[PDB]
């Protein structure tokens, strides 16, 4: 079915032919697509079509295993992928591929709507190469832990010259990122070509705001391991060492974005005048150039076509929002070079937009240890929220028209009905209760009072318990919604928060080096190098010598047949197998030991008649 | 003995260091209030901020009682959850508070009384004042006639609808949540810690002199005084070498007791036995393969011998 549904999207028959043999080129067709991205299989490298092609020594592929760890996935073969995957090489990259092949033939299986049992196991063994993944992993850290560094930042030449991070994420395979030797690995691209690590992150902005300080940080050694993409002096260097550095450029555009901040809440309070501010001028410089860094992103993004590159880009939640307000403050930027009264509407739409960029701080403040984490708590509890928002309305308007029909009887069609049957109830629960309006005295002399509207005797009583059921039922329904969901969104948005260390690494190692204030001149280098050169690649990888290829392979094997050691010896040793053992073993003693005092018998008669011939 | 680090372990106890800090500010009360006014008022000024301090201190001597320590080291505790939800706090106030500005007074010079307006009306909303007056204000009507609306201020109720949702149902019950899921843990820290400190404050009252602070002045005196005429004129048991000897030989009686003690639990716990048992059997096994295989020959040979006779 995979087959028919890629050579039939790729090459525009109908159900496929069964006669037709499926190549070797397709079959790398069908991983390029369960793959997404730009995993190019190393069947559709031009060099194995035209070997292929030319046939129809080399026929033996260099690597068997791999081929065959395919081989089996595609087939559901699981018994035999694990058996493929023990007897090998690279095997951290061939279960974190498998990882990510299985789940991507699982939501393919529920898309085809094929039978509900082969997309409900294809999950169970995605988990089933996933956790021997990190399993493997966690004993490379138990040995040298710099040996498993160079294992996982190893460029995977065969699987699509990739790293086992880049394929992890791809596989969004959680506690692979989690783990520790994969986040003090992330804190190795963070700090960049730097050392510190001792209370950091303040002389790194005492570095921007002071640049005499760059030359008293300690700076990463010589050579190191520097992770890279695709591949008086040195005080220079080192100038730009500390400004590439990923950690360095978040500070730089962060104290932007407060920077931009103080300055559209400035021209927003004081009155603008005809011709915009020196401030304001500022302020409209920032938006469109990281407009400009905005739809760079866009252009730059990991897939080939347009469209699929947008949704690369719309995946990323807050990213879109940008564009949004960018746009918005756009419209309202137009409307204040017009005049009145579009003048002001501009203001007002500037003052929509003074929100969001507040709310932009939230993901901002996400890349601290802990309020990271409680930003991704609030936005698993709005789904809980909104359910709250909801019995809200139902019981908000009950009291809202209600009233509006007995305190108000005669009034005409108007929008200011429904205005007053939001007003003042929903004000309510927030502390008032509008108490010379909840019964003013009536028809009574004071001058006689005016009449009583027949049915006010009942409007204190439905609003009583109004506030029974808002104020008390359900917000203490939400506290223990909120309580008793606080557990499992805790420990899951931990580890949601060092996934997400990650993107956020890869994006800042993209960003330019000079502020968004400032990042014309390092887009306009790019615009030039580019057009300079096209008129005359993401990841963090090293391209270590071949001689230390074979040496992190023998690591690695060395890891493999240690993890099945132990396995097998964990449950050589386990307590419930040794009870399984000894009920076996006494099994075979009892007919045993019922044959030996069954055969002496035979000698106990033996002796004895002896003792008769003597 | 070096002063600076004198100043350090005079420095690890916290309330000292705001006692010192406080005392500081009674004294620069004490000259600006027996100085005249205007800077009399300031001093009494001055006199209420250290009132507030003498008053919370009485929480650092609310700690002998047994349930009230660890209640004062779990509010201790929950300032740090407190600060996260303040700085989210601060962010949502402050964004309704700007809007409200921008919105409700338009023309405004630049002064800093619009931060005091930013700040003022958005934080007592969270208490329950929800300002009903001027939430929406009624505006070009005639009833006099009303002043005109300012562009777009109907935003202003449903920008501040928001916040009210987002302050007073979602962050407080977070708080609520938050409280609630680290109780126990802080149950635990804070009550071995409170039976930890109870060592410090009872080495530091025996080392504290007689006399109360209004009086200390004559032990203080008297002290410096003696010491320095005396130029010229822990609570250890410091047991006899006696007792010392049966004190080694209780304390030899409890490390081979526990020892043994921890080597009869693990035999005597279940995988023990358990493990005994399994390689036990195999040699059973492994015996009783030789025992069969020998009585076979055994019966070849009586066989034979009984084929003899
Ligand atoms: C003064 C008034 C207007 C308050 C404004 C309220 C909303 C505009 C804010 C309040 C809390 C915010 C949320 C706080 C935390 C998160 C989690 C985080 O979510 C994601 O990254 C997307 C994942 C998801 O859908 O939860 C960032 C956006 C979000 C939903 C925020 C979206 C905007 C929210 C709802
Ligand atoms: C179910 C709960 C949790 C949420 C429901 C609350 C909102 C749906 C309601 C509550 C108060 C309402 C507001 C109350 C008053 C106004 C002013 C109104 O503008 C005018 O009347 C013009 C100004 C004037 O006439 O003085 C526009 C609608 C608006 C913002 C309302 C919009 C809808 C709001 C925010
Ligand atoms: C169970 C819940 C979800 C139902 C809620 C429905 C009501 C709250 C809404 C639905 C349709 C609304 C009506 C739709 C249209 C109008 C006309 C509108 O007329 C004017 O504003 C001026 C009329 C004129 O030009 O003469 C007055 C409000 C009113 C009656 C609305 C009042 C409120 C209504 C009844
Ligand atoms: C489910 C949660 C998220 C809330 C549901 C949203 C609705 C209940 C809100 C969103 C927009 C609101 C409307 C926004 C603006 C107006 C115009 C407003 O008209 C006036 O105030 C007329 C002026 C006057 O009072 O003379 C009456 C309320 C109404 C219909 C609001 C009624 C309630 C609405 C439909
Ligand atoms: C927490 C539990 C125990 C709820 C307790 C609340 C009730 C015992 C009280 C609270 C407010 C009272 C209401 C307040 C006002 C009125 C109006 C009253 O009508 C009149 O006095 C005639 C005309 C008028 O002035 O409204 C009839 C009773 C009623 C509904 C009252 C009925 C009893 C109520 C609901
Ligand atoms: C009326 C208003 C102005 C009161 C202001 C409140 C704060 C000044 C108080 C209230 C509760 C106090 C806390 C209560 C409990 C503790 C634990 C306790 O910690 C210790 O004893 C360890 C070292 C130290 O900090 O003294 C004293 C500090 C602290 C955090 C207190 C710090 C000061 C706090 C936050
Ligand atoms: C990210 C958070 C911290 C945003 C907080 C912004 C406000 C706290 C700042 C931003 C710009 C500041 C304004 C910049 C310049 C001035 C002019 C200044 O004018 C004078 O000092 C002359 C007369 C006087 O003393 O008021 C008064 C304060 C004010 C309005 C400032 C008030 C406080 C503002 C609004
Ligand atoms: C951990 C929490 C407490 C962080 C909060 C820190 C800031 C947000 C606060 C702390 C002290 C506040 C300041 C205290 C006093 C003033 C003076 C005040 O001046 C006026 O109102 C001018 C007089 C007039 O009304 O004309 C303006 C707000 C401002 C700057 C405040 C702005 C906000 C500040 C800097
Ligand atoms: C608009 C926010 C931000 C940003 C995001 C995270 C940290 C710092 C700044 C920016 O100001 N420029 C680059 N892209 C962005 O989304």
Same mark, same amino acid.
């Given at each position: 079915?995979?087959?028919?549904?890629?050579?039939?999207?790729? @090459?525009?028959?109908?159900?496929? #032919?069964?006669?037709?043999?499926?190549?070797?080129?397709?079959?790398?067709?069908?991983?390029?697509?369960?793959?997404?991205?730009?995993?190019?299989?190393?069947?559709?490298?031009?060099?194995?079509?035209?070997?292929?092609?030319?046939?129809?020594?080399?026929?033996?592929?260099?690597? #068997?295993?791999?081929?065959?760890? *395919?081989?089996?996935?595609?087939?559901?073969?699981?018994?035999?992928?694990?058996?493929?995957?023990?007897?090998?090489?690279?095997?951290?990259?061939?279960?974190?591929?498998?990882?990510?092949?299985?789940?991507?033939?699982?939501?393919?299986?529920?898309?085809?709507?094929?039978?509900?049992?082969?997309?409900?196991?294809?999950?169970?063994?995605?988990?089933?190469?996933?956790?021997?993944?990190?399993?493997? !992993?966690?004993?490379?850290?138990?040995?040298?832990?710099?040996?498993?560094?160079?294992? !996982?930042?190893?460029?995977?030449?065969?699987?699509?010259?990739?790293?086992?991070?880049?394929?992890?994420?791809?596989?969004? $395979?959680?506690?692979?990122?989690? $783990?520790?030797?994969?986040?003090?690995?992330?804190?190795?691209?963070?700090?960049?070509?730097?050392?510190?690590?001792?209370?950091?992150?303040?002389?790194?902005?005492?570095?921007?705001?002071?640049?005499?300080?760059?030359?008293?940080?300690?700076?990463?050694?010589?050579?190191?391991?520097?992770?890279?993409?695709?591949?008086?002096?040195?005080?220079?260097?080192?100038?730009?060492?500390?400004?590439?550095?990923?950690?360095?450029?978040?500070?730089?555009?962060?104290?932007?974005?407060?920077?931009?901040?103080?300055?559209?809440?400035?021209?927003?309070?004081?009155?603008?005048?005809?011709?915009?501010?020196?401030?304001?001028?500022?302020?409209?410089? @920032?938006?469109?150039?990281?407009?400009?860094?905005?739809?760079?992103?866009? !252009?730059?993004?990991? #897939?080939?076509?347009?469209?699929?590159?947008?949704?690369?880009?719309?995946?990323?939640?807050?990213?879109?929002?940008?564009?949004?307000?960018?746009?918005?403050?756009?419209?309202?930027?137009?409307?204040?070079?017009?005049?009145?009264?579009?003048?002001?509407?501009?203001?007002?739409?500037?003052?929509?937009?003074?929100?969001?960029? @507040?709310?932009?701080?939230?993901?901002?403040?996400?890349?601290? =240890? @802990?309020?990271?984490?409680? *930003?991704?708590?609030?936005?698993?509890?709005?789904?809980?929220?909104?359910?709250?928002?909801?019995?809200?309305?139902?019981?908000?308007?009950?009291?809202?028209?209600?009233?509006?029909?007995?305190?108000?009887?005669?009034?005409?069609?108007?929008? =200011?009905?429904?205005?007053?049957?939001?007003?003042?109830?929903?004000?309510?629960?927030?502390?008032?209760?509008?108490?010379?309006?909840?019964?003013?005295?009536?028809?009574?002399?004071?001058?006689?009072?005016?009449?009583?509207?027949?049915?006010?005797?009942?409007?204190?009583?439905?609003?009583?318990?109004?506030?029974?059921?808002?104020?008390?039922?359900?917000?203490?329904?939400?506290?223990?919604?909120?309580?008793?969901?606080?557990?499992?969104?805790?420990?899951?948005?931990?580890? *949601?928060? =060092?996934?997400?260390?990650?993107?956020?690494?890869?994006?800042?190692?993209?960003?330019?080096? !000079?502020? #968004?204030?400032?990042?014309?001149?390092?887009?306009?280098?790019?615009?030039?190098?580019?057009?300079?050169?096209?008129?005359?690649?993401?990841?963090?990888?090293?391209?270590?010598?071949?001689?230390?290829?074979?040496?992190?392979?023998?690591?690695?094997?060395?890891?493999?047949?240690?993890?099945?050691?132990? =396995?097998?010896?964990?449950?050589?040793?386990?307590?419930?197998?040794?009870?399984?053992?000894?009920?076996?073993?006494?099994?075979?003693?009892?007919?045993?030991?019922?044959?030996?005092?069954?055969?002496? $018998?035979?000698?106990?008669?033996?002796?004895?008649?002896?003792?008769?011939?003597?």
């Amino acid at each position: 079915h995979l087959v028919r549904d890629v050579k039939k999207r790729e @090459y525009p028959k109908g159900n496929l #032919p069964p006669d037709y043999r499926i190549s070797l080129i397709d079959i790398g067709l069908v991983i390029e697509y369960l793959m997404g991205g730009a995993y190019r299989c190393n069947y559709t490298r031009k060099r194995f079509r035209t070997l292929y092609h030319n046939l129809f020594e080399i026929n033996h592929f260099p690597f #068997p295993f791999h081929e065959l760890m *395919v081989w089996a996935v595609l087939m559901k073969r699981q018994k035999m992928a694990l058996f493929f995957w023990q007897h090998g090489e690279e095997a951290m990259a061939k279960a974190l591929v498998a990882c990510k092949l299985c789940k991507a033939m699982a939501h393919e299986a529920s898309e085809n709507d094929m039978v509900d049992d082969i997309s409900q196991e294809l999950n169970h063994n995605s988990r089933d190469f996933g956790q021997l993944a990190v399993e493997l !992993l966690d004993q490379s850290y138990k040995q040298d832990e710099q040996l498993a560094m160079k294992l !996982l930042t190893y460029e995977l030449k065969n699987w699509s010259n990739a790293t086992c991070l880049q394929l992890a994420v791809a596989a969004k $395979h959680r506690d692979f990122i989690a $783990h520790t030797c994969s986040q003090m690995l992330l804190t190795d691209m963070w700090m960049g070509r730097l050392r510190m690590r001792k209370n950091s992150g303040l002389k790194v902005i005492l570095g921007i705001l002071l640049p005499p300080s760059i030359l008293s940080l300690e700076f990463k050694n010589k050579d190191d391991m520097p992770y890279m993409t695709q591949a008086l002096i040195p005080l220079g260097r080192k100038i730009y060492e500390f400004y590439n550095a990923p950690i360095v450029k978040f500070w730089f555009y962060t104290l932007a974005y407060i920077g931009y901040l103080m300055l559209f809440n400035y021209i927003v309070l004081v009155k603008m005048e005809r011709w915009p501010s020196t401030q304001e001028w500022i302020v409209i410089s @920032y938006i469109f150039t990281l407009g400009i860094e905005k739809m760079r992103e866009i !252009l730059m993004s990991e #897939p080939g076509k347009l469209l699929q590159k947008v949704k690369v880009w719309l995946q990323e939640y807050w990213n879109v929002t940008d564009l949004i307000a960018i746009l918005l403050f756009s419209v309202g930027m137009i409307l204040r070079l017009q005049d009145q009264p579009f003048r002001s509407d501009g203001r007002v739409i500037y003052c929509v937009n003074i929100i969001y960029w @507040y709310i932009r701080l939230l993901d901002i403040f996400g890349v601290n =240890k @802990y309020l990271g984490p409680y *930003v991704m708590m609030i936005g698993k509890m709005m789904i809980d929220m909104m359910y709250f928002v909801i019995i809200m309305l139902v019981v908000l308007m009950s009291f809202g028209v209600a009233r509006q029909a007995i305190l108000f009887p005669n009034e005409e069609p108007s929008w =200011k009905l429904a205005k007053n049957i939001f007003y003042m109830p929903y004000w309510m629960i927030y502390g008032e209760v509008f108490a010379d309006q909840i019964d003013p005295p009536c028809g009574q002399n004071e001058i006689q009072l005016p009449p009583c509207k027949t049915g006010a005797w009942i409007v204190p009583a439905i609003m009583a318990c109004y506030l029974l059921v808002a104020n008390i039922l359900l917000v203490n329904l939400l506290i223990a919604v909120f309580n008793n969901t606080f557990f499992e969104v805790k420990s899951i948005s931990n580890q *949601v928060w =060092k996934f997400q260390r990650y993107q956020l690494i890869m994006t800042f190692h993209e960003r330019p080096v !000079l502020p #968004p204030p400032l990042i014309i001149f390092s887009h306009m280098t790019m615009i030039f190098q580019h057009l300079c050169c096209r008129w005359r690649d993401y990841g963090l990888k090293l391209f270590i010598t071949d001689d230390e290829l074979k040496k992190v392979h023998d690591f690695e094997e060395q890891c493999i047949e240690e993890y099945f050691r132990e =396995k097998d010896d964990r449950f050589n040793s386990s307590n419930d197998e040794r009870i399984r053992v000894t009920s076996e073993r006494v099994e075979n003693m009892s007919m045993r030991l019922e044959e030996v005092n069954e055969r002496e $018998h035979s000698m106990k008669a033996s002796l004895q008649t002896v003792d008769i011939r003597l």
